[PDB]
Amino acid sequence: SPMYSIITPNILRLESEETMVLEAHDAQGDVPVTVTVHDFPGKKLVLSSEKTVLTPATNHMGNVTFTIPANREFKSEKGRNKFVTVQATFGTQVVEKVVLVSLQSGYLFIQTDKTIYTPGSTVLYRIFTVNHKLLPVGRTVMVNIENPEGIPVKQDSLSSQNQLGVLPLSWDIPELVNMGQWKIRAYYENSPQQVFSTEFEVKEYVLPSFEVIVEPTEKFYYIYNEKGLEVTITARFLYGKKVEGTAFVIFGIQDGEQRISLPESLKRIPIEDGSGEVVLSRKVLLDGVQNPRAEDLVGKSLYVSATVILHSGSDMVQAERSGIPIVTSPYQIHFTKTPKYFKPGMPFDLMVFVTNPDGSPAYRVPVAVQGEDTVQSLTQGDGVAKLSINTHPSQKPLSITVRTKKQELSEAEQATRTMQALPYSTVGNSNNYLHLSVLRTELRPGETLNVNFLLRMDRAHEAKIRYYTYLIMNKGRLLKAGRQVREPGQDLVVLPLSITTDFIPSFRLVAYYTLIGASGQREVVADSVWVDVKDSCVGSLVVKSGQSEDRQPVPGQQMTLKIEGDHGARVVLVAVDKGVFVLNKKNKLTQSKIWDVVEKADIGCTPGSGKDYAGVFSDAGLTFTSSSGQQTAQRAELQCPQ
Amino acid sequence: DEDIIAEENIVSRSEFPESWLWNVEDLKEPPKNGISTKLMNIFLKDSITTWEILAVSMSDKKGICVADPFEVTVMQDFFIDLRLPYSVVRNEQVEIRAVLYNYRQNQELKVRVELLHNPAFCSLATTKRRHQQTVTIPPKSSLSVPYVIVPLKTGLQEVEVKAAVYHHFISDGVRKSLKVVPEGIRMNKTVAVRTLDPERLGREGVQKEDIPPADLSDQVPDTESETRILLQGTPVAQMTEDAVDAERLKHLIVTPSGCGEENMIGMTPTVIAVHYLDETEQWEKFGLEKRQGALELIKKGYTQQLAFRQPSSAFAAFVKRAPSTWLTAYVVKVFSLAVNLIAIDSQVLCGAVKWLILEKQKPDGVFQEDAPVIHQEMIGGLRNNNEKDMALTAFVLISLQEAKDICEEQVNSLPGSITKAGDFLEANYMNLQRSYTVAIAGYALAQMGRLKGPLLNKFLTTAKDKNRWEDPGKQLYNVEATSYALLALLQLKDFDFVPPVVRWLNEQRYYGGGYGSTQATFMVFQALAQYQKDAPDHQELNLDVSLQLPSRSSKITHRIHWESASLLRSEETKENEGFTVTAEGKGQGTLSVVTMYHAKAKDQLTCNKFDLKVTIKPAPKNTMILEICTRYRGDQDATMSILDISMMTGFAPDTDDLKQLANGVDRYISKYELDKAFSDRNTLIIYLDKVSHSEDDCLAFKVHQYFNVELIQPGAVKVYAYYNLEESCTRFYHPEKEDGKLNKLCRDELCRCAEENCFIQKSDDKVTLEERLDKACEPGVDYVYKTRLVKVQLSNDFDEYIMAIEQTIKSGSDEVQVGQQRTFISPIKCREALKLEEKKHYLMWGLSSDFWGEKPNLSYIIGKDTWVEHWPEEDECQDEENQKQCQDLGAFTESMVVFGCPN
Amino acid sequence: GHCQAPDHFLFAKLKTQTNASDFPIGTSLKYECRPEYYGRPFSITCLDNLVWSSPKDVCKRKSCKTPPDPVNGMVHVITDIQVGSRINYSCTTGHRLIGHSSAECILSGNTAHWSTKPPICQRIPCGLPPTIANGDFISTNRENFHYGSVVTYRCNLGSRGRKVFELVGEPSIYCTSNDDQVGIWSGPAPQCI
Numbered sequence A: 001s002p003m004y005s006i007i008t009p010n011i012l013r014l015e016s017e018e019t020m021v022l023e024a025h026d027a028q029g030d031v032p033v034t035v036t037v038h039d040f041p042g043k044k045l046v047l048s049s050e051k052t053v054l055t056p057a058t059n060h061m062g063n064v065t066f067t068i069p070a071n072r073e074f075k076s077e078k079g080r081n082k083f084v085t086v087q088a089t090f091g092t093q094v095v096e097k098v099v100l101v102s103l104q105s106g107y108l109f110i111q112t113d114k115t116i117y118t119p120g121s122t123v124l125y126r127i128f129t130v131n132h133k134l135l136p137v138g139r140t141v142m143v144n145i146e147n148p149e150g151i152p153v154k155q156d157s158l159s160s161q162n163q164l165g166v167l168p169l170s171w172d173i174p175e176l177v178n179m180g181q182w183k184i185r186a187y188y189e190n191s192p193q194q195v196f197s198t199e200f201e202v203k204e205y206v207l208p209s210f211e212v213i214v215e216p217t218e219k220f221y222y223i224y225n226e227k228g229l230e231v232t233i234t235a236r237f238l239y240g241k242k243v244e245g246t247a248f249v250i251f252g253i254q255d256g257e258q259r260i261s262l263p264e265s266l267k268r269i270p271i272e273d274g275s276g277e278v279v280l281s282r283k284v285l286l287d288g289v290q291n292p293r294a295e296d297l298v299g300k301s302l303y304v305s306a307t308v309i310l311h312s313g314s315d316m317v318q319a320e321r322s323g324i325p326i327v328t329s330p331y332q333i334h335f336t337k338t339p340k341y342f343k344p345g346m347p348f349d350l351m352v353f354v355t356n357p358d359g360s361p362a363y364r365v366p367v368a369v370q371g372e373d374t375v376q377s378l379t380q381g382d383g384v385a386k387l388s389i390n391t392h393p394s395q396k397p398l399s400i401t402v403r404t405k406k407q408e409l410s411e412a413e414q415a416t417r418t419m420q421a422l423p424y425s426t427v428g429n430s431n432n433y434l435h436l437s438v439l440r441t442e443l444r445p446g447e448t449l450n451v452n453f454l455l456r457m458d459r460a461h462e463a464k465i466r467y468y469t470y471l472i473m474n475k476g477r478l479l480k481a482g483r484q485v486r487e488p489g490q491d492l493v494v495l496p497l498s499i500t501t502d503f504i505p506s507f508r509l510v511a512y513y514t515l516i517g518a519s520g521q522r523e524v525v526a527d528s529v530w531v532d533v534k535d536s537c538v539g540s541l542v543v544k545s546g547q548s549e550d551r552q553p554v555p556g557q558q559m560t561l562k563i564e565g566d567h568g569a570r571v572v573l574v575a576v577d578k579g580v581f582v583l584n585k586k587n588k589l590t591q592s593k594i595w596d597v598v599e600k601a602d603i604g605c606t607p608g609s610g611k612d613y614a615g616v617f618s619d620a621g622l623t624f625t626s627s628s629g630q631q632t633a634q635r636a637e638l639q640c641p642q
Numbered sequence B: 001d002e003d004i005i006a007e008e009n010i011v012s013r014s015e016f017p018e019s020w021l022w023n024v025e026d027l028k029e030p031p032k033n034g035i036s037t038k039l040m041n042i043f044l045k046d047s048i049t050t051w052e053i054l055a056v057s058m059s060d061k062k063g064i065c066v067a068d069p070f071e072v073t074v075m076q077d078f079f080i081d082l083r084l085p086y087s088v089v090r091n092e093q094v095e096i097r098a099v100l101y102n103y104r105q106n107q108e109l110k111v112r113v114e115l116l117h118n119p120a121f122c123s124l125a126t127t128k129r130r131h132q133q134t135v136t137i138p139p140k141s142s143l144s145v146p147y148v149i150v151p152l153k154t155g156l157q158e159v160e161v162k163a164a165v166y167h168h169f170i171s172d173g174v175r176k177s178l179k180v181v182p183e184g185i186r187m188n189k190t191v192a193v194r195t196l197d198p199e200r201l202g203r204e205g206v207q208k209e210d211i212p213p214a215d216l217s218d219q220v221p222d223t224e225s226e227t228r229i230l231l232q233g234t235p236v237a238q239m240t241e242d243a244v245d246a247e248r249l250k251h252l253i254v255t256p257s258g259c260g261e262e263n264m265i266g267m268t269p270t271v272i273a274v275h276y277l278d279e280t281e282q283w284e285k286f287g288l289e290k291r292q293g294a295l296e297l298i299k300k301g302y303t304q305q306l307a308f309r310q311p312s313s314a315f316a317a318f319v320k321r322a323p324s325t326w327l328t329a330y331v332v333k334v335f336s337l338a339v340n341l342i343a344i345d346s347q348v349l350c351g352a353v354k355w356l357i358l359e360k361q362k363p364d365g366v367f368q369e370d371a372p373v374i375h376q377e378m379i380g381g382l383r384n385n386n387e388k389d390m391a392l393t394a395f396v397l398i399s400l401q402e403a404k405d406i407c408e409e410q411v412n413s414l415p416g417s418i419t420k421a422g423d424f425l426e427a428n429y430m431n432l433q434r435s436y437t438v439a440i441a442g443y444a445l446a447q448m449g450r451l452k453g454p455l456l457n458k459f460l461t462t463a464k465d466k467n468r469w470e471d472p473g474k475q476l477y478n479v480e481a482t483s484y485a486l487l488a489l490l491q492l493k494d495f496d497f498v499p500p501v502v503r504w505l506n507e508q509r510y511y512g513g514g515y516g517s518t519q520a521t522f523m524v525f526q527a528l529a530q531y532q533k534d535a536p537d538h539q540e541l542n543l544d545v546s547l548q549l550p551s552r553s554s555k556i557t558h559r560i561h562w563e564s565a566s567l568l569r570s571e572e573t574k575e576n577e578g579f580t581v582t583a584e585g586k587g588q589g590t591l592s593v594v595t596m597y598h599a600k601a602k603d604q605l606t607c608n609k610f611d612l613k614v615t616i617k618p619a620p621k622n623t624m625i626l627e628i629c630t631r632y633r634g635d636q637d638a639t640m641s642i643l644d645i646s647m648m649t650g651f652a653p654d655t656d657d658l659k660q661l662a663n664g665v666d667r668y669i670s671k672y673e674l675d676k677a678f679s680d681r682n683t684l685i686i687y688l689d690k691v692s693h694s695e696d697d698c699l700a701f702k703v704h705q706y707f708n709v710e711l712i713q714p715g716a717v718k719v720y721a722y723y724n725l726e727e728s729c730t731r732f733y734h735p736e737k738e739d740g741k742l743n744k745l746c747r748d749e750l751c752r753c754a755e756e757n758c759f760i761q762k763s764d765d766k767v768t769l770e771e772r773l774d775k776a777c778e779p780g781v782d783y784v785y786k787t788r789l790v791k792v793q794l795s796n797d798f799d800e801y802i803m804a805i806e807q808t809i810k811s812g813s814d815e816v817q818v819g820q821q822r823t824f825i826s827p828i829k830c831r832e833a834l835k836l837e838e839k840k841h842y843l844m845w846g847l848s849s850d851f852w853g854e855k856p857n858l859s860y861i862i863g864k865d866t867w868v869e870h871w872p873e874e875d876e877c878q879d880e881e882n883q884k885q886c887q888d889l890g891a892f893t894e895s896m897v898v899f900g901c902p903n
Numbered sequence C: 001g002h003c004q005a006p007d008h009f010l011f012a013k014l015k016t017q018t019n020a021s022d023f024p025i026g027t028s029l030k031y032e033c034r035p036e037y038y039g040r041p042f043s044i045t046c047l048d049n050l051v052w053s054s055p056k057d058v059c060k061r062k063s064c065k066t067p068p069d070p071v072n073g074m075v076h077v078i079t080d081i082q083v084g085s086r087i088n089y090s091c092t093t094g095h096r097l098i099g100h101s102s103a104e105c106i107l108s109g110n111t112a113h114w115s116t117k118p119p120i121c122q123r124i125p126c127g128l129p130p131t132i133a134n135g136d137f138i139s140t141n142r143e144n145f146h147y148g149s150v151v152t153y154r155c156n157l158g159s160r161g162r163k164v165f166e167l168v169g170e171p172s173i174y175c176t177s178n179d180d181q182v183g184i185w186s187g188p189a190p191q192c193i
């Protein structure tokens, strides 16, 4: 009984290259395959254009690369969801699956020259138009400009064709204008549902002479600290010289979105050598609010508003540090990187993410799961620590409680969290599992990664597994497909995996084997895992000094600038006075934000594994279909469950 | 001065951009180890600050990359920082500051600082005289130099200061810009809201609208305005009756089985379920895997059905049984609908049709059943009618018209048979006694468009309550007939009648799929599918809007459609003008016109929360006493406050007096200024812990003048709360000037600077006749009068001399006849230099720019170019010291009057 | 006794009588910086060693201001801003230059001010889109078009709406220029038939 299987991405996109996996299991000879895509329902013949031949010595597996053309969008804002029918014929046999379609063409990014503007000035902004592979593409893009009240005052429709994915643009802010937060909105012509936006502030301002930066000794506040909140004020000129002046500093408590000032926290301190110190006493803090219990203040934040005035009295600059948490503990525990399902009898790998109250990853923090002794781990650079526990064969859900083991804390100050994992369910209780283990962390492009395939099943049928089928999913598409061979008797095999720049920001690895089980029954066993890759650029862009370091350049002098980048690329530049950022540092363009937008656009909703093979595929953002009837469930939802 | 670079030789730094280097560069450099390197030689701007450079790279391979920021620190050893606000108010006196920074480690600099003269400002710097100070700046320090100016003309003006140090090459200058805002506040006046409905509210389907200019009564002259026009389309959706919930359709998937009849009974619900779910797009809640399965069932039903197809192409229950007309017709009716689903052989279908026509059709156009079907529950309401000739003829005819487009170009006898049967249906229609037949034959005739006039009226009036077509009997017949009637209405496109019908069908809660439910199910779902297929979900929207502005000969065009309904149209004009809107087409629009402008509203300028009184009094070199009294406006005393005090040039506070305040309670003075040298403190800041809201909190200290100089500048006192700089109060102090105010002359909303010389430089040098003649013959000089001072009216500010003109030597743009009085205005402080007293005579001449108010009512102003010469009395001319003057006066007068100028 | 004719600095000028070769000991001569330069007025004296005194750095050459970064434009500066130097202006993409591209550092002899004024690079305008029978284009902008603006065609549906004719031949088109001039449409493709 030769079995034909098709693997596709969970959701399909328009005007983007998608790949499809064709497999013929237990077959003979060269099997021809034709792939057709139609509208659902009916026949529009969207793409019939991909034809291929599966052969032995190719081990009966093949790629199909197609790009689905766009009807664009007639309707509607309301939707609703559109599906397409993917059908594949191997010589005779027909296997078909209907797939959900997202209208997203690609990504759009908007870069404004400054973070703040004046009435009667010009806002310069570029629009980067890319596909899902973040490659440059000429396309039609709709642009709108919304005032604070939300009314678009200007809208155009532009083409990025022959612009190399960069659209230079400008808008003149009127002299009679509404003050507030202005927004630049943009979207693709074929996809009005996906809108990318940026903000910029219009205000009456002047660039200051200097900048003020206030910092706490630590980024949180311990409720029982008698010292109170200690704040160091730093004020430096734009040219780097320190300052001499007088500063006014006051504190406050933030709960919800509501702020409450502390009147008796007002202090006037001298500024000497561009520095100063001020302390909010616990007495003043607890007196300001009449709520007698101190523990009630936990889960609230503090804010410091410092105002530095020069000894000339000409220039005055204010600054604020907000969101200083009042906590019982310096740390917190998060399971968002750990799979929620386990293989009974097989090692379960937990990834615990310990963070500081500000969200910054904690560094070198002891953690453990009760209980107790043998397991311990220290958090890495990314703030994640690995804890691997052994697993009982029982069907009882696994309840895991993780605590921080750091010394010098009274256990009242220790962070704890409790998770639960569920047993992977097999076919007909055959108890045949598959365990993918990837250990190494802080992975970078160019490195190789050993993937450990651990097979669990009775040795009676073990000789029938000659291979594992693996898929590398990245950025919502299929990055790679392959076959890892297995000789009879090999329970654990290793697959070397080369890591290119195409795995950034991260990737998913799914694998499955299939065999005929007890009494003529087809069983498909699968497992998945998620691997984080170091976030970075694909290429490199550096801007440095072109001359030796002697002394600072004088206004009016020429400066040679060195740029280090990829061959053939186009580089756009901007220069901003740092006095600007004193007023507004928000909404600045950053690669981190790009990869964040990409990682939010991922169709995979889980860190790994699944409740069953169908669950494994679907959760990892894949669809598996077979002529024997084994197939994934249907996801009609566009977003990730939450 | 001694060994110093001149002011004129200094080029000030004018460029202070907040953003630049918008440059675009491609890397063409051949890669060395994968990295291309381009070197950029660029030009740093005038600003002293750190410039941050952000780069983004776009490659056709590697994609997008956002580089990390790069900083460049731009600084000098000695420089000027000129601190200007964002905007200043016209005619209001303000004090800006120029802070000189010397960062040199061991070296102190002797500095000369000068403010440039601008016609747009009133300062101590005149046209022929500069305003310059000489101050010493210690190593690694800074010094603030206050300047007091009054803005004059609106718009964006320019302020420029220069400085250079003695015995060194060091120099610097700063040229910045500042916005001069007139008195007022931004106000949004809503002009017009107009509702657009060219169909309902328009004439001839066209609605034109007239929009007048905005009021703008309180608008400030010469100020701008912006009129904004918004066109907002309004979507109108019509309620479309609820489609049948797919949860009720689940039972309609049935595996086809049995012989020639049963096979169709089982094929029926599975075929129509797809048809309906396809149009209603309910598969998502139904599930997508079910469809293809159903398609397999359909293909099965068809394939099995082909086993009952006789050589005659006719269909019958069993191969041994005589062919059934109705069964074959129903097979045609089903396979016709199945074309959208599964592959079907046209030969089988059109073959069955051809057999129907060439066999079962009578010469009168009637189709007749020779061999009745075995299941009488599968034929629906064909029973009991006794009209069955008509009913069957209709059924068969419908099955023929559904298969037409496929079989038309194949079977030649199809249209013939169609029209043949159509005549028969047409002739007998009016005699129909049963609603069911009226419905089926109604739809039968409607596909020909032959249901018209009396027949159509018979069809419509048959419906009870204009909702349901029904006869007494079993319900299924009434439902089926109602379905046929719905297909009829939809065929004739009468949508007024439709909704009450569909509302009734869905109300019956009939999902079909039971014993003998074939006809009911099939027809009700065919009808309810065609309904949703043909049902409009919206009212047609096409808008043609045009705009006629008197300021633009160009025609403004905007087209609004139903996909545009979400989109908002915006148009702007800076000129306030009445304009015309020409609208046309279907749909409902909304028009909004709103202007933004500047209001004449006063005052808008005040010390908000602070009352400030400053009094400087002579103490019993020179020592004076400065006293500052302040009170906060509110229900509570203010928190920590700031007193920013500048100095009259050449003055310093008494160093001793400061300590008592500083060491006193509630008062704080930084030690920085306390141990600072007596010299070079022109700026002192007194930090107050509080200021009372009840009674005035006052303080005072002595000030010594260490440098004597002519024309000292008033000092300033600024009180403000540390948390808010925007709310403050500014006061000036001068011993010889009222309230610290500079001399300026204002009427209406316009003011001119009084800080120049009171009049032309006096004699000596003693004036001769050629001097007066040549000077008065200058083309610029407008008027020359001989006058007599009538009465001196003094005021708190400006002196008004009433001069009666006794004769007019030269006349200007003003029309003035001999004997008419005129008023001359002079700044106080110039009164004792003028030494004018009543009854004496004077000679005056001036320019055309010195007039006060507009013609022909004028007052004269005495400026730097204004000539005033005392004319001795006739009896006083006999005196031996008046001789030359009198001779010159008479001479000049008659020479000017009689001969005029040679030029 | 007696110091010879003073050396020629040539970047500074003496305006007063020089009638003599051998100067005596301790006699101040006044050297003012040449109009091509600028510096503080100074005086050179005999060392008593028969050699004249050395100037500190009193005098310097000149330069013409600061070249501004124009709106939507690139300033290519070769060498320095010193007198007689040339700088160039280039609009990179989608804009036409109104002005003089080449700019010169000048000396009017009293004071320096740039010979040419900074040019303005303006967005390439386009004429009306090609009009075809039986069909129209849709956009928020109709009357006034600028460079890079893209317009999309369609076919009129009448009133009730029906599928009339067929949309054929590349409905979307945009403004572009293959030379620096007024922009022309990418192509006059569309038809409704």
Ligand SMILES: *[C@@H]1O[C@H](CO)[C@@H](O)[C@H](O)[C@H]1NC(C)=O
Pocket (backbone or CB within 6 Å): A019, A063, A064, A478, A479, A480, A481
């Ligand atoms: C499909 O095959 C092509 C070669 O024809 C190969 O380059 C590509 O990597 C394959 N795609 C996948 C996802 O493996």
